[PDB]
Amino acid sequence: RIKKISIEGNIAAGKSTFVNILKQLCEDWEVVPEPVARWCNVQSTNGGNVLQMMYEKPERWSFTFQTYACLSRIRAQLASLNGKLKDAEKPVLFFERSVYSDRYIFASNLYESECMNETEWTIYQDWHDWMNNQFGQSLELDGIIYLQATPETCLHRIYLRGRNEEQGIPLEYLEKLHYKHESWLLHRTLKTNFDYLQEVPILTLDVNEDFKDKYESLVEKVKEFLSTL
Amino acid sequence: RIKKISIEGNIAAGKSTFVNILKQLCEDWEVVPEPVARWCNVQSTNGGNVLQMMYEKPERWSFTFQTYACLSRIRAQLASLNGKLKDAEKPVLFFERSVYSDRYIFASNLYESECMNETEWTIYQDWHDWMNNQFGQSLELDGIIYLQATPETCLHRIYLRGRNEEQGIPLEYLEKLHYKHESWLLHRTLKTNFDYLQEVPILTLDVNEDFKDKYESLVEKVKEFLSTL
Ligand SMILES: Nc1ncnc2c1ncn2[C@@H]1O[C@H](COP(=O)(O)OP(=O)(O)O)[C@@H](O)[C@H]1O
Ligand SMILES: Nc1ncnc2c1ncn2[C@@H]1O[C@H](COP(=O)(O)OP(=O)(O)O)[C@@H](O)[C@H]1O
Ligand SMILES: Nc1ccn([C@@H]2O[C@H](CO)[C@@H](O)[C@@H]2O)c(=O)n1
Ligand SMILES: Nc1ccn([C@@H]2O[C@H](CO)[C@@H](O)[C@@H]2O)c(=O)n1
Ligand SMILES: [Mg+2]
Ligand SMILES: [Mg+2]
Incomplete structure (x- = not known):
């Protein structure tokens, strides 16, 4: 019942800026941001900055980062789908990126x-x-x-x-x-x-x-x- | 309905040796081995030997190995539970180690x-x-x-x-x-x-x-x- 739309773009293209004007256009619209601040302070659901680790030494930390970011995304997207948006009349969920760009980009x-x-x-x-x-x-x-x-x-x-x-x-x-x-x-x-x-x-x-x-x-x-x- | 028993022991204690005599004792008994040969030749469901990588440089490869081994175990254990043993009269599934020893040991x-x-x-x-x-x-x-x-x-x-x-x-x-x-x-x-x-x-x-x-x-x-x- 929930329509799902992925917002895709390069680093700093303006995904979050665009995401920040969507909810005001319709009460039945919800957004799932990438949890970028959490990738910078790793804590179980002061910690390591795994985003910084990847950029400082990508041949060491890319696999660890890429696996963690994608799992964190899936968890967040599932949490939003299974929440109160399920109840709205014309629900639309907008994702800041997808599992497909995690892998293929x-x-x-x-x-x-x-x-x-x-x-x-x-x-x-x-x-x-x-x-x-x-x-x-x-x-x-x-x-x-x-x-x-x-x-x-x-x-x-x-x-x-x-x-x-x-x-x-x-x-x-x-x-x-x-x-x-x-x-x-x-x-x-x-x-x-x-x-x-x-x-x-x-x-x-x-x-x-x-x-x-x-x-x-x-x-x-x-x-x-x-x-x- | 299926009873689940974990066989635990140190490296080379004899888990596989013990596992290899169980099925002959009762037709309703099944075993899930650790897929150690697969950890030595990584292939999607000639490849890298991730077990060897961990032992050659554990500060580089432990996290990668530990995550891969445990996922591979869960997948194998779920495959056995959801198979034909589900149909037997007095089913017992024996695991060569558990997710608990993966983490806590x-x-x-x-x-x-x-x-x-x-x-x-x-x-x-x-x-x-x-x-x-x-x-x-x-x-x-x-x-x-x-x-x-x-x-x-x-x-x-x-x-x-x-x-x-x-x-x-x-x-x-x-x-x-x-x-x-x-x-x-x-x-x-x-x-x-x-x-x-x-x-x-x-x-x-x-x-x-x-x-x-x-x-x-x-x-x-x-x-x-x-x-x-
Ligand atoms: N179209 C635009 N015009 C002017 N500034 C923009 C525009 N889109 C984004 N910005 C600015 O560029 C920076 C990055 O935007 P942000 O939304 O964080 O990107 P992303 O979420 O895609 O990484 C911010 O400082 C933001 O104000
Ligand atoms: N109780 C035992 N007595 C003599 N040899 C044993 C015994 N248990 C295991 N072995 C031998 O020790 C080696 C390791 O056994 P294995 O079953 O592969 O251990 P694990 O599965 O626990 O790593 C094999 O060569 C096996 O024949
Ligand atoms: N699968 C992903 C997803 C995101 N990222 C990175 O996260 C930061 C915020 O978008 C950006 O620096 C960059 O996009 C990444 O490296 N890999
Ligand atoms: N979580 C796990 C499970 C197993 N192992 C290792 O796998 C090999 C075969 O049991 C053994 O060399 C050793 O037990 C491991 O390092 N970590
Ligand atoms: Mg953003
Ligand atoms: Mg064994």
């Missing part, structure tokens, strides 16, 4: 960059497949909103936000991530193991311009898109 | 030995807790059989078996593991997060003598124990 890029070895990559995919067989059904997407921004725009927006753990990220890394997003969501040439994704509707929104100026037109396009689903 | 010892750091140890426990909340119920134990052998006997039995990945294991490591088994299963002073375990019945069998000579008396004690459950 982030973890795949780190494997390709030799930050995971063959063993790590095999274990990660085996784990991801199993987690999706146990839960993929309830989290299946009805639509994707792709917030498209240049990697140079994203690099500027990392500076604007000032999240400590991201200040060292080089343009080269954001560029690699950009081309993976374009392959998946614009050209639709990135192959995955989840056949339904090749037909899921995608709304592409260019977010290179200032949000203050673009807001009204973005909202119009979102409401139109959601009326087709 | 093996992973805890590696953390204590500084082979996992605080971040790794927090992530592992958080993961273990979540996996047990999702599955702990169906895998709950009715009894434990503890195959007790000296660490010196175990060191000799590693030599006898000749598993390549274990030939370098020092007596010091087997001794640490021995005292953890004794605390958990003999003195019953090792605290866990699973309250029912402090009352689960335990049969302790001394297996320092040759199996050929001890077999008949061991079988008698097992049949007696199982009749009390």
Whole structure:
């Protein structure tokens, strides 16, 4: 009954900014953010900063981070689905990213960059497949909103936000991530193991311009898109 | 309906040897071995040998191994419970170790030995807790059989078996593991997060003598124990 929409975009493209205007548009809309602050202070459900560990030494910490982030996402998304939104009249749940970008964008890029070895990559995919067989059904997407921004725009927006753990990220890394997003969501040439994704509707929104100026037109396009689903 | 018994013991104490005589005693008995050969050639459900990686560089590979081994165990134990044993008249499933020894013996010892750091140890426990909340119920134990052998006997039995990945294991490591088994299963002073375990019945069998000579008396004690459950 709940419609599920993933918001996808590169680092600092503006996913959280876009997420922060959604609830005011309709009482039956809910959001599941990525728990980025929790990845910076690991505590059981003062701790280690696993996001910082990955960026400081990615060949050591990528597998650990990638497994922890994706599990944390699944847990949060399931918590929202099984909560009070279940009761609303026209419920829509918006996710800040998906299990699909965790694997096909982030973890795949780190494997390709030799930050995971063959063993790590095999274990990660085996784990991801199993987690999706146990839960993929309830989290299946009805639509994707792709917030498209240049990697140079994203690099500027990392500076604007000032999240400590991201200040060292080089343009080269954001560029690699950009081309993976374009392959998946614009050209639709990135192959995955989840056949339904090749037909899921995608709304592409260019977010290179200032949000203050673009807001009204973005909202119009979102409401139109959601009326087709 | 299925009774579940964990067989616990140190490395090379003789768990597999004991497991290999059980099915011939009763048609309704089944066993779930640890998939040790699979840990030596990692393949999705020629690959990396994650058991060897842990022993070659435990401060690098302990967390990865410990997470993979425990997931692989849970998957195997669930597969056996949900299979044809479900149909038998007096079904008993024997596990070669449990999720409890994965955490409280093996992973805890590696953390204590500084082979996992605080971040790794927090992530592992958080993961273990979540996996047990999702599955702990169906895998709950009715009894434990503890195959007790000296660490010196175990060191000799590693030599006898000749598993390549274990030939370098020092007596010091087997001794640490021995005292953890004794605390958990003999003195019953090792605290866990699973309250029912402090009352689960335990049969302790001394297996320092040759199996050929001890077999008949061991079988008698097992049949007696199982009749009390
Ligand atoms: N379209 C936009 N115009 C101007 N600033 C933006 C825009 N989108 C995001 N920002 C700013 O860029 C930074 C990153 O935005 P954020 O929403 O945290 O990105 P993400 O959630 O995608 O990582 C913030 O400082 C935010 O104010
Ligand atoms: N009680 C016993 N007497 C003589 N040999 C034993 C005995 N128990 C085990 N062995 C031998 O010790 C080695 C390890 O046994 P195994 O069953 O593989 O241990 P585990 O499964 O506990 O790692 C094998 O070579 C096996 O034949
Ligand atoms: N699977 C994932 C998901 C997210 N991340 C990273 O988390 C931070 C916040 O989005 C960003 O720095 C970056 O996207 C990641 O590395 N891998
Ligand atoms: N949680 C676990 C379980 C098992 N092991 C190791 O696997 C091998 C076969 O029992 C043995 O070398 C050793 O017991 C481990 O290190 N950690
Ligand atoms: Mg965000
Ligand atoms: Mg064995």
